[PDB]
Amino acid sequence: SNATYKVDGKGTYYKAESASFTANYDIKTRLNGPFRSNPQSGVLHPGQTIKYDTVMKQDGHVWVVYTGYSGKRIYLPVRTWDKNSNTLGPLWGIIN
């Protein structure tokens, strides 16, 4: 897997990707990195749209990363990911 991703020191796969994401559920966002155990930043509600710059795979999900007003980095899970099969669940929103 991950021929066109890189991998960081926590084993998170990442690559640059510029697009928007419109949520279709209340999706919890995280501070610090793409782990559900991290401190919560907040939520996207259905119909809210963010512009992201990086896609990551960690903690059972694909995540996208964007920047808050204050400059902080915010990590948003968008679908499930199975690492051993290299397959993805359905998106929880709309890309672009």
Ligand code: NA
């Ligand atoms: Na992991």
